[PDB]
Design a protein around this nucleic acid. Sequence first.
RNA 1: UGCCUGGCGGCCGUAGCGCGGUGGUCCCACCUGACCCCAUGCCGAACUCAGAAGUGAAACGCCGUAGCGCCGAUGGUAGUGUGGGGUCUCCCCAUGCGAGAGUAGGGAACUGCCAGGCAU
RNA 2: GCUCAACGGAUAAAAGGUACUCCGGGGAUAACAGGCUGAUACCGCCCAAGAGUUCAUAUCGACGGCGGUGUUUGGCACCUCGAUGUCGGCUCAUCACAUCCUGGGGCUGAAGUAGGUCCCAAGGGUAUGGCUGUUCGCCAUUUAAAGUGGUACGCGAGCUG
RNA 3: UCCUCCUAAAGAGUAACGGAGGAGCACGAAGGUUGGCUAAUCCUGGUCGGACAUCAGGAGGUUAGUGCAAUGGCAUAAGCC
RNA 4: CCGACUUACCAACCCGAUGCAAACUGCGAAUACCGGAGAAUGUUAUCACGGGAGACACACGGCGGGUGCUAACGUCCGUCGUGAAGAGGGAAACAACCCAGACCGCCAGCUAAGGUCCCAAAGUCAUGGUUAAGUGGGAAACGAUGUGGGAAGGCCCAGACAGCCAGGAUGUUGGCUUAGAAGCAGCCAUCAUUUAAAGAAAGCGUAAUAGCUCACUGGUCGAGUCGGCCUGCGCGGAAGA
Lengths: 84, 136, 94, 58
Amino acid sequence: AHKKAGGSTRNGRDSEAKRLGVKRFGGESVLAGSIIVRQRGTKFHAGANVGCGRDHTLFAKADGKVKFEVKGPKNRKFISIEAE
Amino acid sequence: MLQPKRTKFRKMHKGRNRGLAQGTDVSFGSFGLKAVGRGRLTARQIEAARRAMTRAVKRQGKIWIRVFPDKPITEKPLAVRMGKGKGNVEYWVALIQPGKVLYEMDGVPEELAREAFKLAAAKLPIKTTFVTKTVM
Amino acid sequence: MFTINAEVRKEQGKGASRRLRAANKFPAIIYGGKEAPLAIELDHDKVMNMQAKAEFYSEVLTIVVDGKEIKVKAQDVQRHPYKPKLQHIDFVRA
Amino acid sequence: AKTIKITQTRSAIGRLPKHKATLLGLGLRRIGHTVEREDTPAIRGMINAVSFMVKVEE
RNA sequence: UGCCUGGCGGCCGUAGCGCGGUGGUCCCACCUGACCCCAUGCCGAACUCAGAAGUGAAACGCCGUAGCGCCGAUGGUAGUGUGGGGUCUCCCCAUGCGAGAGUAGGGAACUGCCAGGCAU
RNA sequence: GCUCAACGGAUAAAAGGUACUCCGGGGAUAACAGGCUGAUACCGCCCAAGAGUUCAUAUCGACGGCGGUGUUUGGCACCUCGAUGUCGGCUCAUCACAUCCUGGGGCUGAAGUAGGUCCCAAGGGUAUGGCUGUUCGCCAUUUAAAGUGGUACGCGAGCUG
RNA sequence: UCCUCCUAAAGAGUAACGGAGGAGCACGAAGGUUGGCUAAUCCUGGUCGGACAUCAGGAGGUUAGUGCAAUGGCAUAAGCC
RNA sequence: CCGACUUACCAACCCGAUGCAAACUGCGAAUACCGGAGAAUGUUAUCACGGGAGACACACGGCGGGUGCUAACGUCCGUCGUGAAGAGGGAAACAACCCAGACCGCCAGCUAAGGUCCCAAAGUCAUGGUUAAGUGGGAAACGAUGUGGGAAGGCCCAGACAGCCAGGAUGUUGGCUUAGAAGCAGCCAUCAUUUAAAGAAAGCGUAAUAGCUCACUGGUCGAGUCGGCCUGCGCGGAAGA
Ligand SMILES: [Mg+2]
Ligand SMILES: [Mg+2]
Ligand SMILES: [Mg+2]
Ligand SMILES: [Mg+2]
Ligand SMILES: [Mg+2]
Ligand SMILES: [Mg+2]
Ligand SMILES: [Mg+2]
Ligand SMILES: [Mg+2]
Ligand SMILES: [Mg+2]
Ligand SMILES: [Mg+2]
Ligand SMILES: [Mg+2]
Ligand SMILES: [Mg+2]
Ligand SMILES: [Mg+2]
Ligand SMILES: [Mg+2]
Ligand SMILES: [Mg+2]
Ligand SMILES: [Mg+2]
Ligand SMILES: [Mg+2]
Ligand SMILES: [Mg+2]
Ligand SMILES: [Mg+2]
Ligand SMILES: [Mg+2]
Ligand SMILES: [Mg+2]
Ligand SMILES: [Mg+2]
Ligand SMILES: [Mg+2]
Ligand SMILES: [Mg+2]
Ligand SMILES: [Mg+2]
Ligand SMILES: [Mg+2]
Ligand SMILES: [Mg+2]
Ligand SMILES: [Mg+2]
Ligand SMILES: [Mg+2]
Ligand SMILES: [Mg+2]
Ligand SMILES: [Mg+2]
Ligand SMILES: [Mg+2]
Ligand SMILES: [Mg+2]
Ligand SMILES: [Mg+2]
Ligand SMILES: [Mg+2]
Ligand SMILES: [Mg+2]
Ligand SMILES: [Mg+2]
Ligand SMILES: [Mg+2]
Ligand SMILES: [Mg+2]
């Protein structure tokens, strides 16, 4: 014909971005309950004064200053808080 | 016709051919064909060069292919408009950076190996040069 | 047996090394033993003809810096990817 | 307190937003304008950022 | 105060593997027996109980040794922010930052509290 | 209690034709032509396995590579939808040269006749009919030859339809 | 409409009729807690029995597993009883 | 009754040496982002609330990409600049490129990009070099004793590179193959001899011979010569209305 009709793709789908990542970095002063990192799995583990939610959201269990550190035999990344 | 037996995915992004090469030394044979320019070597191009180069030396010595076509290239058919998904895989190519050794040769005299690589480089789009093995 | 006249580098880095190679010298280092490593520069063409020999890379070389003798070995060589040039040379003392 | 003199030698029409803010933090308003600024590492960093378009006399 | 041993940490491979040797006073481990407390999808293997005949074999601790693991410069290279150029699919120059790999080397952990045994 | 899944869900409840058409708009958006590009196409060149009795390059030329032109099929949607009339024919042309004839030349697997293939050359010249709306094409018979392409696939305020 | 990865340029976000896959559930245990336990694969030996069933030892160390895609995570297991 | 070997076959796992990856990571930047502190600068440039909007067709250029042909003044994103909504100077003419942001007037001066022989303002400026192609002032693979520069190499008054004179010989027509293969279709060998030298021959030629040169050598001449490597600027490749 004058023009050749094309096909169709089968890859159009994608899901919404979940806004994961670190919310407060090292040195941030946070209130109790502040979300530090939103995660899939425990890439960062909960240290002192830090709690882990059902979806592994790390949140502050006290007022203070955020600190990242590496601890344990496995060199895992822990998030703790110095109470200030 | 060099081509991967199976691939994890059948199509790949266009990408960019930047940087210098890895594998710039004659590691297997005694002589080598080294790419001076950059570009794409199709499997047909590589195989045509291999036929001339192996036939030049009267099937003597040993011939090494140092490059492999692992990047699939898609082409839209004639007279189809833009869009409607990505095109179909037509052929495969290897990306070539300046300095990469494309072919190696051993077991033959240097004057014969030089002549064989001349005929072989006549089939390649990229500028080449003749190199020999060195002790590092 | 090979005598290499080399002068210690005044400045180092990417810009300095590229300027040096444009001026037809190339950087090299001498490390080993207990003395701190010494960064030298030396003439490209003289050493390019010298290293065309196979015995250059095995036998003991001589490097003259500030009129003082250092006994070295050609530990490694970095060549230009396609041009017949030397980017850098690693030398080991004794 | 080397108290150096900063002059602007080039225009700020199509410069990056960061470079425009650096000129404003240095206090330069037009080509040929000259200002008095105290010699601090903080000020020397500003001069280094926009060195392609300012000159320093001291 | 010196050595040996046990427990709880710091630390997270320079600390872990391998190879060789070495220890039973105390300790540790193997070990003896088991209606029983307690336990096995069965099984006193493990867990548990009652004990101390034997033994340091395994294990565990210690000592030595690079066949590995690991750590690792200097220099160079790749990349790159800013500004400027070219022959602009890619590069180059000024300046700032500067890897990865590799090399020379390093390397058979160091350390804190308490408890016990030997010796002074 | 909703494949209200057209999933921020028009109504509880709904498919088509229009060349008999009509209005408001858009070159925001297609068909012709121009424009950009040049995958494809055409032309040229690079390397020579081989065909050519033998002999790669008289003549061809595999597998491959690099360009040119704007010239086919395309890609895009930049211009025109308060209109740029769209094929073929007739009349009248004009340019380019990648030359169909005539002119000059090199090589030939050029004995002569007659060719083949390149190089130079655009001064002039370069069919009539049968059949189809045809351009083409096939066919008949000529010719020294019945060239290729651009000119809005030249030319409808010049004709035809 | 929703989920996972890439494009996405090391914070977030980021388009195309871009490249690939899934969901419209399931489970009163497959949830809570306490206690306990640790794979894939290969070698050697062993009745039917063999490449590959159950068993013993060794190597190996998560190369397994997760009710269902993909990514991240998981031994203090989030895996098994 | 369980066995013990072997060969030029296939050969997984493993080892050593090599590359490749948007949907690979035992590594890993520059930047960007978040936060804390300090100075200087900035007409609060920041946030909040309220009155009024417009706008939700973007375009090109740089950089990072997807798609397309790393085709398009193509298309789709990120980011910056410009145009939109921006005059002026430059790029011949040329919204988006380079320089630079027009409050008004002046027959004042200095500069930016870009330029200075004439059109047309300003160097027929100074020093050193290169090109001969009007290259400059379109285009590749590829080709060539163009020409400049650099580092090294071979030979040479014991006579070197040309050229000229003379030889270039005996096993031998090496064997195999082939209708023939006589140095020279093709295979294996490529050795001996007299030599000053000479190849079981580099090429032309023959149906096979024959014949003609070359390698190599002696003489003649009597001073430099030959071939690669790197590199600057040129040359051909290069045909449209
Ligand atoms: Mg799919
Ligand atoms: Mg730089
Ligand atoms: Mg470094
Ligand atoms: Mg490093
Ligand atoms: Mg390293
Ligand atoms: Mg809807
Ligand atoms: Mg909707
Ligand atoms: Mg109407
Ligand atoms: Mg209208
Ligand atoms: Mg339009
Ligand atoms: Mg059109
Ligand atoms: Mg558009
Ligand atoms: Mg128009
Ligand atoms: Mg119209
Ligand atoms: Mg009108
Ligand atoms: Mg012509
Ligand atoms: Mg005339
Ligand atoms: Mg008629
Ligand atoms: Mg015409
Ligand atoms: Mg027309
Ligand atoms: Mg008309
Ligand atoms: Mg009329
Ligand atoms: Mg009329
Ligand atoms: Mg991100
Ligand atoms: Mg980012
Ligand atoms: Mg809208
Ligand atoms: Mg829009
Ligand atoms: Mg846009
Ligand atoms: Mg556009
Ligand atoms: Mg603006
Ligand atoms: Mg507007
Ligand atoms: Mg303007
Ligand atoms: Mg103008
Ligand atoms: Mg002036
Ligand atoms: Mg004048
Ligand atoms: Mg002058
Ligand atoms: Mg010209
Ligand atoms: Mg013959
Ligand atoms: Mg040229």
